Amino acid sequence: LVDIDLSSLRDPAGIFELVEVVGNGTYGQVYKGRHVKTGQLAAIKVMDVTEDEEEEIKLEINMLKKYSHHRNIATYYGAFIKKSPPGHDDQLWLVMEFCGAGSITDLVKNTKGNTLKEDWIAYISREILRGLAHLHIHHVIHRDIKGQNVLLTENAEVKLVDFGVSAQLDRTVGRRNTFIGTPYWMAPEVIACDENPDATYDYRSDLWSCGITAIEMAEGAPPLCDMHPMRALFLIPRNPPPRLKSKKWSKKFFSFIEGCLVKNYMQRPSTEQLLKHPFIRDQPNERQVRIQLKDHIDRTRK
Amino acid sequence: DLSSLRDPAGIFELVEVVGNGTYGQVYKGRHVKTGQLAAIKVMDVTEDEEEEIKLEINMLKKYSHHRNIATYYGAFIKKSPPGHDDQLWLVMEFCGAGSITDLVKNTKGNTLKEDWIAYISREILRGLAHLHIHHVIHRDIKGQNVLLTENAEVKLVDFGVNTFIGTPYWMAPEVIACDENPDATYDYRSDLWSCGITAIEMAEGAPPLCDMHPMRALFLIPRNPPPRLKSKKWSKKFFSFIEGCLVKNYMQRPSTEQLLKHPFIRDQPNERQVRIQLKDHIDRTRK
Numbered sequence A: 001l002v003d004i005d006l007s008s009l010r011d012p013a014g015i016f017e018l019v020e021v022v023g024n025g026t027y028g029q030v031y032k033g034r035h036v037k038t039g040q041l042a043a044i045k046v047m048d049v050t051e052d053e054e055e056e057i058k059l060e061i062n063m064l065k066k067y068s069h070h071r072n073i074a075t076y077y078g079a080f081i082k083k084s085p086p087g088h089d090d091q092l093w094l095v096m097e098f099c100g101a102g103s104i105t106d107l108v109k110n111t112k113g114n115t116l117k118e119d120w121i122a123y124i125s126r127e128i129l130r131g132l133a134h135l136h137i138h139h140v141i142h143r144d145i146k147g148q149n150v151l152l153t154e155n156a157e158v159k160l161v162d163f164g165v166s167a168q169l170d171r172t173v174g175r176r177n178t179f180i181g182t183p184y185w186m187a188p189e190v191i192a193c194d195e196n197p198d199a200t201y202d203y204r205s206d207l208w209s210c211g212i213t214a215i216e217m218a219e220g221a222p223p224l225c226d227m228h229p230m231r232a233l234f235l236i237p238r239n240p241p242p243r244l245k246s247k248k249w250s251k252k253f254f255s256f257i258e259g260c261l262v263k264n265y266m267q268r269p270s271t272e273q274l275l276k277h278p279f280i281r282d283q284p285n286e287r288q289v290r291i292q293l294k295d296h297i298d299r300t301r302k
Numbered sequence B: 001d002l003s004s005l006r007d008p009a010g011i012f013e014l015v016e017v018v019g020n021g022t023y024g025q026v027y028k029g030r031h032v033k034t035g036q037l038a039a040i041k042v043m044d045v046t047e048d049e050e051e052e053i054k055l056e057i058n059m060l061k062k063y064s065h066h067r068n069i070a071t072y073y074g075a076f077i078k079k080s081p082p083g084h085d086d087q088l089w090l091v092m093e094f095c096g097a098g099s100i101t102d103l104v105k106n107t108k109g110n111t112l113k114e115d116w117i118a119y120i121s122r123e124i125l126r127g128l129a130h131l132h133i134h135h136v137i138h139r140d141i142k143g144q145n146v147l148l149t150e151n152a153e154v155k156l157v158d159f160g161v162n163t164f165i166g167t168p169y170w171m172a173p174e175v176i177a178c179d180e181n182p183d184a185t186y187d188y189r190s191d192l193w194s195c196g197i198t199a200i201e202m203a204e205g206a207p208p209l210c211d212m213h214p215m216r217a218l219f220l221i222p223r224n225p226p227p228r229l230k231s232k233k234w235s236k237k238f239f240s241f242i243e244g245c246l247v248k249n250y251m252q253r254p255s256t257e258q259l260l261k262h263p264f265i266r267d268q269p270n271e272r273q274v275r276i277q278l279k280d281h282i283d284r285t286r287k
């Protein structure tokens, strides 16, 4: 798009507009929007921000790493501030490519038995991996791969949520930064312990999260769901790699999970290696899966 | 019943973001009909929730009636259009002077006078003593949850409160799971550790380890010796009070009643003047 500037905080007038009526009290909810110049739909994350946070947002935007677009990433369109008079708070807008069919989590929640068919898991997992491969080659770690951050377009295209990942813009607004988020999709290396005191992310941390997302697609929830988050945090580096509960799954799927879920990131395969895994590489029903997913989308849209 | 909750249209308007009790945001709310101020904790009702907010509202109305706890007014449901969750509005007492964190950040040198720390710490302890006798653990004592009214009254907010971990800096060692503590216990005494961290925050402008990434702070809290005031300027009674709050093993940590008898808390002859001095600061902070 012609009027996109990812390096500056601008007024959205004449660039983007909300289509849904946005009320009072926003803190990260996503609304249908539109690119004014092209008419193309957009997803707009809206947050009420203080005058102080706006100054901070400006610096964070300067630190945004850049990367070309990719069919498996919901294109990030920038950050905007919609001004209010002094005293009353302004609103930060984070703008992204619109994905109509909702998240992978909603898809599984809406599916009978909260389990997706294996060939659907293979298709979705490959698209996630292709999205990650693109970020990784540009030296960007997603950091929040989970079913809720993997979206479907109307045409069953798979896209990773990008509301400014290379500077975690959506997890800093209302002091959500000082906070440890949800731990269920966290790799062992991102959690500090005796052998790992400097809990440092690596590109490979996204691959562990991708494996947890594949279990989430298979069982409707990540392995340590409902457990107090502090206990999940203690158990992740200690427990054996999570494994699918049901015996119904193919050997290739169990094998794919073993690849993602190597606890020691130094021994965990790269995104390129996981893309060559038979579960991902061999998809002869790929044409049909898209058709099957596209029908599930159109049937839930009523 | 949750269905009995009315729409806030024509009753309350959201003015500006004041805090965050995450879940959701906290707003300075203006009563449309009277012009009177209130704090509004806005949250999306997944429902799901149902019992979760029902028991939050239940404990808000049950325990808000103590001079050291901000009083609960009522609740509203802002019905949202399809495709979005409805919003729950919890209306609370607006504490005009803001949080003790803001107070210290606005103070020159990011340090409060010792007799102010003693006064604030005692009111926190009195608020905690009320919750503890009613078998309630606050679980989130920190400068951001300790507020000052315009009359320099000290009030606690966001008590008795879930798949995410908040900020870890004020967490007691027992609330953090490790080899020797796999269960991550919450005891009434966990609030006392947090109270000690809040006293350091009042003294230095930030809790110990504020620098560290939250995950690293989480690893260091059970390992590091009890935090201690950096400056040598503080009195021995204040160092002694911190030693009392900051006993790492909660089984050996004094109760709220024992800490209320500590000389730093018990001996406050300038109590009348401190309130005057605090009221002066808050009324001065108007620009």
Ligand SMILES: c1cncc(Nc2ncnn3cccc23)c1
Pocket (backbone or CB within 6 Å): B018, B019, B020, B021, B026, B039, B041, B070, B092, B093, B094, B095, B096, B098, B099, B144, B145, B147, B157, B158
């Ligand atoms: C409930 C839960 N978490 C935070 C709050 N914050 C406030 N509440 C009341 N007055 N006030 C003035 C400034 C900030 C606040 C309340």
